[PDB]
Every structure is written in C-alpha cells, then in structure tokens.
C-alpha cells in the first residue's frame, strides 16, 4: 500500500546522438518518479530492456531541471566527472552508475545534496563517462564535499584524482581537455 516517498522527485532522460540537429532537441524525458518503489521499478526494467550503445546517454535530474547547461540550475554549475578506462569491465560501469543514482535519490551528501542537479552517463567507445552535475561551480565547500564523498562512495583508487569542470569551461573548450576547477 504505502509507497516510501523519496524525500524528492526525479526525471529520467534519454539522449540519442543526432548531431545534424540542435543538441537540446535530442533529449527525451522517459518518466518521472518520487518513491523508492518506482525508482527500483524503473531501474530494474530499463536495465533488462535496454542495450548499451555509443552515443546513447541517460540522465537523472531533479524535477524541473533539464539535463543541459542552458537550464537555469545548470548554467552557473559544473560536474564531477568520472572517466572510465576503455578497458573497464561492464560490471564496473553498472556498479558506478547505480551507486551514482543511489547517491542522488538517497541525498547522500547531507546538506550539500541541495546543490546536486542530476547525473549523466555517456556511453562512448573512447571511454564511458559518469558525472554528477551541481548548480554552482563557485561553491567551493559544497563542490569539494560532494566530490570527496562521491569518490569514496564509488570506491575509486585514492591515487587517481577525479576532476570538477565548470559547465562554462566545458562549453568553450578547445584542447578538448577541459580544465578542472577542483580535483579530489
């Protein structure tokens, strides 16, 4: 009977790389949820009925935030980016992505989870990517707290840093090695 409210409401987005297009016109809102039961119903189903493919990306964002730099909650923000080796086991990708989602819907960064906008997985033959997007790239204390807890929660090796990129820098990159406002 009684569903267990997620403290907050969430939307899953899909993106299939059409690039003739306007980037934003390729998003797709898949469905929304705000209970523990509906999260797992969606996660279980999407995993079994989907297939990993290059260019086909997924985003989970708080209700009302579109997963794009242009959104008001994202324009001043940035992301903690995890870049996977080409060589990683699919098992790693699965675990990292679910652990990321659980950090989102479980509000794992305590008072700083209010800075969290969503998370994105990019499926790329060059190397898969997972990131948590936050709303203000100049909030050093919130951004660095989120980064540290996130890196630990995924059990990443302490010797390799992960980087926080501002969306403003990402969009204007040229080397296509975007610089990191912060590392952890």
Ligand X SMILES: O=C(O)/C(Cc1ccccc1[N+](=O)[O-])=N/Nc1nc(-c2ccc(-c3ccccc3)cc2)cs1
The reply, when asked if residue 113 is annotated as ligand binding, is no
Instruction: Rule CB under 6 A: say whether 23 interacts with ligand MGP.
Output: yes
Buried b (16+ CB within 10 A) or exposed e, 128-155: bbbbbbbbbbebeebbbbbbebbbeebe
Instruction: Rule CB under 6 A: say whether 101 interacts with ligand X.
Output: yes
Chosen from ligand X, ligand MGP, none, partner binding at 23 (C-beta under 5 to 8 Å by type): ligand MGP
Judged by CB under 6 A, the chain residues 57 through 96 that form the site for ligand X are 58, 60, 94
End-to-end Cα spacing for the chain: 43
Cα–Cα distance for residue pair 101/85, rounded to 1 Å: 20
Residue 132 Cβ vs ligand MGP, minimum distance, rounded to whole Å: 14
**Which one, 30 or 68, has the nearer CB to ligand MGP?**
68
Give yes or no for a contact between 68 and 154, defined as CB atoms under 8 angstroms apart.
no
**Which one, 36 or 68, has the nearer CB to ligand MGP?**
68
Residue 182 Cβ vs ligand MGP, minimum distance, rounded to whole Å: 19
Cα–Cα distance for residue pair 31/58, rounded to 1 Å: 12
Q: Which residues bind ligand X (CB under 6 A)?
A: 12, 42-43, 46-48, 50-52, 58, 60, 94, 101
């Amino acid at each position: 009977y009684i569903k267990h409210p997620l403290q907050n409401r969430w939307a899953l987005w899909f993106f299939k790389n059409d690039k003739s297009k306007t980037w934003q016109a390729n998003l797709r809102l898949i469905s929304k949820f705000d209970t523990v039961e509906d999260f797992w119903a969606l996660y279980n189903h999407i995993q079994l009925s989907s297939n990993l493919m290059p260019g086909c990306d997924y985003s989970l964002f708080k209700d009302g935030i579109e997963p794009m730099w242009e959104d008001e909650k994202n324009k001043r923000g940035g992301r903690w980016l995890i870049t996977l080796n080409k060589q990683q086991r699919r098992s790693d990708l699965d675990r990292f992505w679910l652990e990321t989602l659980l950090c989102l819907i479980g509000e794992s960064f305590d008072d700083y989870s209010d800075d969290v906008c969503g998370a994105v997985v990019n499926v790329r033959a060059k190397g898969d990517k997972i990131a948590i997007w936050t709303t203000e790239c100049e909030n050093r204390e919130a951004v660095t707290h989120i980064g540290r807890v996130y890196k630990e929660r995924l059990g990443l090796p302490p010797k390799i840093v992960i980087g926080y990129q501002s969306h403003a820098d990402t969009a204007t990159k040229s080397g296509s090695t975007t610089k990191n406002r912060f590392v952890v």
